[PDB]
Amino acid sequence: FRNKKQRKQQVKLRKPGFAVAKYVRMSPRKVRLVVDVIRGKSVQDAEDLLRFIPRSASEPVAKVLNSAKANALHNDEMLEDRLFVKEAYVDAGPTLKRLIPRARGSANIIKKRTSHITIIVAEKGNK
Amino acid sequence: PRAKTGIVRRRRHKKVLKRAKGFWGSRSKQYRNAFQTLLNAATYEYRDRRNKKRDFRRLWIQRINAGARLHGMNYSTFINGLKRANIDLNRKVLADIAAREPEAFKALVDASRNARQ
Amino acid sequence: HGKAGRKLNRNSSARVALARAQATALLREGRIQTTLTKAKELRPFVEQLITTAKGGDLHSRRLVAQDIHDKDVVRKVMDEVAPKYAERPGGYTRILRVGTRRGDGVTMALIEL
Amino acid sequence: AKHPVPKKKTSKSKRDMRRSHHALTAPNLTECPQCHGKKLSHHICPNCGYYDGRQVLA
RNA sequence: AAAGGUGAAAAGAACCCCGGGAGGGGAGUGAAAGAGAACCUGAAACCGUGGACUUACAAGCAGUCAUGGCACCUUAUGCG
RNA sequence: GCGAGAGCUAACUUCCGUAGCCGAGAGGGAAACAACCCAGACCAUCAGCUAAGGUCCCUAAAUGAUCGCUCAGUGGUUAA
RNA sequence: GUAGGGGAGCGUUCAGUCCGCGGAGAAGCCAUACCGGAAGGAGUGGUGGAGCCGACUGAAGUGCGGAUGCCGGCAUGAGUAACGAUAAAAGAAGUGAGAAUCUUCUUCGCCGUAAGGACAAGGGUUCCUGGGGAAGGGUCGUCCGCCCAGGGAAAGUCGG
Numbered sequence: 205f206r207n208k209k210q211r212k213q214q215v216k217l218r219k220p221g222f223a224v225a226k227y228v229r230m231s232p233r234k235v236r237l238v239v240d241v242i243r244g245k246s247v248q249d250a251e252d253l254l255r256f257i258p259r260s261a262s263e264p265v266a267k268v269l270n271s272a273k274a275n276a277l278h279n280d281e282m283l284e285d286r287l288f289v290k291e292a293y294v295d296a297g298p299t300l301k302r303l304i305p306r307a308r309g310s311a312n313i314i315k316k317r318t319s320h321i322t323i324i325v326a327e328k329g330n331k
Numbered sequence: 332p333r334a335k336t337g338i339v340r341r342r343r344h345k346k347v348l349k350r351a352k353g354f355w356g357s358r359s360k361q362y363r364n365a366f367q368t369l370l371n372a373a374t375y376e377y378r379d380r381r382n383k384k385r386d387f388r389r390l391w392i393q394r395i396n397a398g399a400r401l402h403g404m405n406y407s408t409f410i411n412g413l414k415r416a417n418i419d420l421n422r423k424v425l426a427d428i429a430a431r432e433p434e435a436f437k438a439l440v441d442a443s444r445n446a447r448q
Numbered sequence: 449h450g451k452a453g454r455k456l457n458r459n460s461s462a463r464v465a466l467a468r469a470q471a472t473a474l475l476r477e478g479r480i481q482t483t484l485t486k487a488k489e490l491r492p493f494v495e496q497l498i499t500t501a502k503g504g505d506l507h508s509r510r511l512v513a514q515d516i517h518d519k520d521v522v523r524k525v526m527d528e529v530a531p532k533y534a535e536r537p538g539g540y541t542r543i544l545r546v547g548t549r550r551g552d553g554v555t556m557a558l559i560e561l
Numbered sequence: 562a563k564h565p566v567p568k569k570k571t572s573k574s575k576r577d578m579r580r581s582h583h584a585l586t587a588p589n590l591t592e593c594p595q596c597h598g599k600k601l602s603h604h605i606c607p608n609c610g611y612y613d614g615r616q617v618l619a
Numbered sequence: 620a621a622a623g624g625u626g627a628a629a630a631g632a633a634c635c636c637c638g639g640g641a642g643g644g645g646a647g648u649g650a651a652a653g654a655g656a657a658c659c660u661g662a663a664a665c666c667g668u669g670g671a672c673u674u675a676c677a678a679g680c681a682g683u684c685a686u687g688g689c690a691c692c693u694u695a696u697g698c699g
Numbered sequence: 700g701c702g703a704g705a706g707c708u709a710a711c712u713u714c715c716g717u718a719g720c721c722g723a724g725a726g727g728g729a730a731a732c733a734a735c736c737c738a739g740a741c742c743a744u745c746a747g748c749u750a751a752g753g754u755c756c757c758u759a760a761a762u763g764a765u766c767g768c769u770c771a772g773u774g775g776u777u778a779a
Numbered sequence: 780g781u782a783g784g785g786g787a788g789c790g791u792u793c794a795g796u797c798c799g800c801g802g803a804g805a806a807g808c809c810a811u812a813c814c815g816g817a818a819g820g821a822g823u824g825g826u827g828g829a830g831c832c833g834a835c836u837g838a839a840g841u842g843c844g845g846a847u848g849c850c851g852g853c854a855u856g857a858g859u860a861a862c863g864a865u866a867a868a869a870g871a872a873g874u875g876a877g878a879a880u881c882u883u884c885u886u887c888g889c890c891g892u893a894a895g896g897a898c899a900a901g902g903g904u905u906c907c908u909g910g911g912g913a914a915g916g917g918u919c920g921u922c923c924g925c926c927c928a929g930g931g932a933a934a935g936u937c938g939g
């Protein structure tokens with residue numbers, strides 16, 4: 205094993221079949237709805253469903269899935285016909301705050317929330 | 332010099348927060364409510380310490396005239412006999428005998444009936 | 449309750465203009481892509497114009513001219529299309545559903561003769 | 562001011578409980594007979610443009 | 620008004636992949652990229668994903684004490 | 700509570716005297732209940748005796764013993 | 780045992796003295812069933828990546844749950860109210876990664892003592908061209924009064 209210092213140079217820390225769309229200008233809540241259908245499904249169903257879910261979050265999500273697919277293949281040399289959505293989740297990016305005017309002189313703050321859409325693909329393996 | 336809070340508060344806060352283990356909602360998550368919950372728990376802790384001491388005697392008394400009645404007696408009566416037969420000072424664990432050893436419990440019922448009549 | 453029968457998502461004046469506009473477009477083009485509902489509503493009105501034109505006399509033309517304000521379209525419907533549908537026991541106009549649009553998420557459709 | 566107003570913040574539980582019915586329903590996608598790229602029932606296949614024969618361009 | 624901090628040194632990431640881009644994954648640099656330019660540590664509120672035990676006859680300052688059921692053994696098997 | 704005035708020999712009224720408790724008093728009892736009854740908590744026990752109160756079942760402990768009374772649910776709304 | 784009086788101490792920063800520790804891993808953070816009569820204090824592991832416990836004495840900007848307290852971050856209400864005049868719109872063709880929304884054609888409708896046109900005040904490059912597409916645009920933009928670059932403004936007689 206040695207000590208931490210050595211471990212850091214010996215083992216270099218990998219992200220197999222992981223992709224992330226950081227700072228996506230959409231609300232987590234809203235984006236989650238789409239991701240929620242795609243989770244657990246086989247990367248091909250995931251691909252096909254996304255093309256028909258009539259939500260604008262579909263485009264962002266679908267893109268992450270293709271990055272996760274490409275990464276799984278090209279970088280990690282995984283088997284395409286075995287890929288499935290092992291994990292997908294939407295985490296909250298930083299909020300774009302904006303000042304909206306209301307009646308009688310008072311102001312308000314619009315929260316233009318952002319998303320961190322991460323999807324991780326893996327090979328199935330029943331056996 | 333300037334003596335800032337830094338560390339003192341957080342340590343004290345995390346302490347209270349850790350007493351709140353399986354407390355519902357905010358009670359296990361926000362300090363003010365966690366600490367607040369514990370004051371009421373304090374009342375409960377001190378009370379129940381001497382309250383369990385009433386609880387068990389009652390469970391024991393219950394198992395006693397349950398057996399005493401099984402042999403045609405009762406608690407008031409059975410304990411009076413065991414008092415009259417001075418020799419018997421059992422009192423504590425007289426319910427284990429009633430629960431686990433019926434044969435042995437009868438012996439005590441029989442002995443109580445005598446010292447009384 | 450509400451057991452009537454027709455549609456109107458605008459006001460009298462407009463509901464007419466729309467029907468007449470889409471009627472002129474389908475007859476000009478032969479096929480038009482529109483909202484599914486606007487297409488469902490257009491179907492009976494254009495089918496009715498074909499039957500009027502199937503008369504082939506001045507009165508039948510002028511009646512078409514009341515809803516078809518484009519002179520060239522009225523000639524097309526009168527002398528080209530109605531004749532072709534002579535033996536068709538008035539049915540032709542069909543609706544095909546394309547799928548959901550981006551901006552409003554509305555399912556588009558086709559209406560062809 | 563703003564006449565009826567909420568009396569207490571609604572708990573993390575309560576809030577999520579009303580969310581039980583928000584879960585989207587995935588399309589019932591069918592395999593296309595003549596280009597196989599999935600389509601919606603009663604709709605023209607987006608890939609080949611068929612609906613028995615080819616109806617739309619591309 | 621508010622705002623500080625890569626790395627010892629810019630060696631500031633050539634090249635490849637998904638993407639219009641953003642963003643990411645690799646390759647390489649470096650002691651470390653568990654430092655990548657929204658660059659020291661990175662608490663807490665607050666948002667999620669996963670697992671354990673659980674919950675659709677129940678009246679609830681949300682604990683406390685008692686007991687039973689399940690589960691886990693890194694101040695940790697008499698006990699927790 | 701007792702002793703008085705004010706008050707209607709009203710008020711969870713007011714104002715003195717006097718004793719106690721609450722205030723600043725937890726614990727048992729009185730269904731619940733500052734004050735009334737019992738009793739003044741240094742800490743630990745899965746020991747024992749009592750107080751006021753209790754002993755059908757909810758709910759600890761006699762569905763006790765003797766002689767009586769009351770049949771109205773009186774007990775479990777006051778008077779001429 | 781409330782006001783209150785008295786006693787013994789825990790903890791933080793700074794200082795002086797002693798004893799040490801640290802890149803073979805400091806502080807800080809995170810987890811923990813250990814210890815002490817309390818404030819509290821250790822052991823172990825994890826993270827961090829350069830400082831720092833312990834003891835004695837000295838000094839304080841020295842301990843927070845409250846103040847409709849101050850600063851900041853983030854929740855609830857809730858995917859709710861709204862999206863700023865009820866003067867419309869339709870289709871075709873084009874462009875583009877992407878089009879209800881940009882361009883073009885044909886209709887439609889609304890103003891017409893105006894919702895047309897020319898000044899003054901005021902504004903300050905918003906003008907034209909080519910390009911952009913993060914934010915601004917109550918939606919989307921391939922477009923814009925936005926972003927970048929270049930250009931344009933000509934007086935003896937007009938106004939001073």
Ligand SMILES: CC[C@H]1OC(=O)[C@H](C)[C@@H](OC(=O)N2C=CC[C@@H]2c2ccc(NC(C)=O)cc2)[C@H](C)[C@@H](O[C@@H]2O[C@H](C)C[C@H](N(C)C)[C@H]2O)[C@](C)(OC)C[C@@H](C)C(=O)[C@H](C)[C@H]2NC(=O)O[C@@]21C
Nearest residue numbers: 305306307308309310311312562563564565566567568847
């Ligand atoms: C329109 C909006 C504005 O509210 C207002 O003006 C409405 C009409 C007022 O209502 C009233 O007066 N009435 C409502 C019920 C009775 C009373 C009333 C009484 C008599 C008459 N008589 C006739 C015959 O006509 C009319 C009305 C409001 C509600 C006022 O509150 C009332 O105050 C009373 C003193 C005590 C009342 N309670 C507590 C018993 C309380 O309800 C007041 C003072 O605002 C005036 C509050 C403060 C907060 C503001 O100033 C806000 C910010 C306003 N400022 C702003 O711009 O928004 C507002 C909300």
Ligand SMILES: [Mg+2]
Nearest residue numbers: 708777778779
């Ligand atoms: Mg009388």
Ligand SMILES: [Mg+2]
Nearest residue numbers: 363844845848
């Ligand atoms: Mg506060």
